[PDB]
Amino acid sequence: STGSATTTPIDSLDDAYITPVQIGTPAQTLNLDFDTGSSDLWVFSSETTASEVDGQTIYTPSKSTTAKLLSGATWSISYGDGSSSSGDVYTDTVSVGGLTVTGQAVESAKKVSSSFTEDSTIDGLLGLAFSTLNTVSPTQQKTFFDNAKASLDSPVFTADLGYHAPGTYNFGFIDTTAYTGSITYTAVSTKQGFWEWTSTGYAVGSGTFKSTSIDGIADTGTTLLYLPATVVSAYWAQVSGAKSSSSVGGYVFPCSATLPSFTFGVGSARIVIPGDYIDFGPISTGSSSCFGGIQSSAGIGINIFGDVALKAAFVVFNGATTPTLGFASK
C-alpha cells in the first residue's frame, strides 16, 4: 500500500504545516501537525476542557462506530517549546492520503496548554519519530508509520515541505519526480528516539564550506533551524545590524536586509537554504526588527534541523531494519 497527502502552511510565515487525517467511522477529518520529532498521535476532542478549545475541529469518539476506549491508558506530553497536552486513549481507524491503519492509538486530549488553544488551525499532532518516545501509559503505543510499515510497498515516508506553498507527505514510495539529482543517504541513531543524524558541515552565502560534524535531528514539528552558537554567529555576522536579543529571545535583523543563503552538508552533498527561507518577519506587528530563522541550540541540548532546513530538500525517512535518512535537492 501507499498514501499521499498534501501538507499546507498554517500562515504566511510557514510557522507549521497541517495535513488532513481521517479518523473514525464515518470519517472525521482533522488537520494534524505531522511531527517527526515526537511519537504521539493526539487530537482535540469532545473530552477537551471546553475553555481550552477555540476554533479547532474536534474528534468525538462516541460518533465513531470503530472507536474503542483503550481501558486504563493515559498520556501526557511536553514539547521543546514548553507546550503540553494530556488525556486518555481510544483505538480507531486512521487514514492519511488513502493509507489506512486499523487499531491506531488516537490520544484524546482532556487538557491542552495555552499555545495549542491559541492556534485554531492545528487540531492535534501526528508523531513520526520512533515509537520508543510514545507517552501512553501503562502500555506504550505505536506511531501511525510503525503500524503501517509492514503493509507499505517500501518501509519509508517522505517529507516535501513547501516554502510559502503546499507540499506533500508520501508513505510507502519515493516520488522520483519530486526532486532533482540523486538522494544522498546518511546514518541515523535511534538511541534518543529521534531521526538523529550528523551533518558534514556548513557554508554561509557564497563562502567556503566548513567541514565539521553537526549532530542533530530531522524535526518537521519544529519551525526553525537550531545550530551551535558558533555556526549561528558566523551566519548572522554576514547581516548588517543583526544581533542576538535576550528580550526578544534570539537573533533579530533589520527587516530591510537581504539575507544570505545557508548550506548544510549531507555526506558529500549539499543542501542550500535560500536567504528568504530564513526571514520570519517582524518581531511584533509593524516592527522593522525581523526574527531570524536560524537560531542557537545552546541550552536546548540538541541541534534541530527544523522546517527551515527540511523545506529546502526532499527528505526520505527510511524505516528499514537499520533506519537511515535521505536528502535530495528539489
Q: How many domains does the chain have?
A: 2
CB neighbours of residue 1 within 10 Å? 14
Question: Are 293 and 328 within one domain?
Answer: yes
Backbone angles phi and psi of 196, in degrees to 5: -100, 130
Q: From the candidates 35, 40, 119, 123, which is the catalytic residue?
A: 35
Q: From the candidates 64, 199, 261, 296, which is the catalytic residue?
A: 199
154 is catalytic: no
Domain boundary among 143, 174, 205: 174
Question: Are 113 and 216 within one domain?
Answer: no
Cβ contact 209:4 at 8 Å = no
Cell numbers 462506530 label which residue? 65
What is the C-alpha to C-alpha distance for residues 196 and 59, in angstroms, rounded to an integer?
A: 32
Q: Which three cell numbers mark 304? A: 534541530
Question: Are 102 and 183 within one domain?
Answer: no
CATH number at residue 166: 2.40.70.10
Question: Are 168 and 181 within one domain?
Answer: no
Question: Are 134 and 192 within one domain?
Answer: no
Cβ contact 23:41 at 8 Å = no
Question: Are 90 and 135 within one domain?
Answer: yes
CB neighbours of residue 209 within 10 Å? 14
Question: Are 248 and 329 within one domain?
Answer: yes
Residues found in the chain: 330
Cell numbers 469518539 label which residue? 61
Domain boundary among 132, 152, 174: 174
Cβ contact 313:278 at 8 Å = no
Question: Are 143 and 210 within one domain?
Answer: no
Domain boundary among 111, 145, 174: 174
Question: Are 155 and 207 within one domain?
Answer: no
Sheet holding 196-204, edge to edge: 269-273, 262-266, 196-204, 210-218, 303-305, 225-227, 294-296
Range of the domain at 125: 5-174
CA-angle at 41, arms to 38 and 44, nearest 5° = 120
Question: Are 96 and 36 within one domain?
Answer: yes
- Using CA of residue 148, residue 154, residue 157, residue 162, what is the dihedral sign? negative
Element (H, E) at 110: strand 99-112
Buried b (16+ CB within 10 A) or exposed e, 114-145: eebbebebbbbbbbbbbbebbbbeeeebbbbb
CA-angle at 147, arms to 146 and 148, nearest 5° = 95
What is the C-alpha to C-alpha distance for residues 106 and 93, in angstroms, rounded to an integer?
A: 9
For residue 97, the 8-state DSSP code is T
Cβ contact 13:81 at 8 Å = no
Question: Are 18 and 156 within one domain?
Answer: yes
Question: Are 244 and 157 within one domain?
Answer: no
Mapped onto helix, strand or coil, the DSSP state of residue 144 is helix
What is the C-alpha to C-alpha distance for residues 314 and 266, in angstroms, rounded to an integer?
A: 12
What is the C-alpha to C-alpha distance for residues 131 and 273, in angstroms, rounded to an integer?
A: 30
What is the C-alpha to C-alpha distance for residues 31 and 177, in angstroms, rounded to an integer?
A: 26
35 is catalytic: yes
Mapped onto helix, strand or coil, the DSSP state of residue 174 is coil
3-state helix, strand, coil in the chain (%, to 5): 10, 45, 45
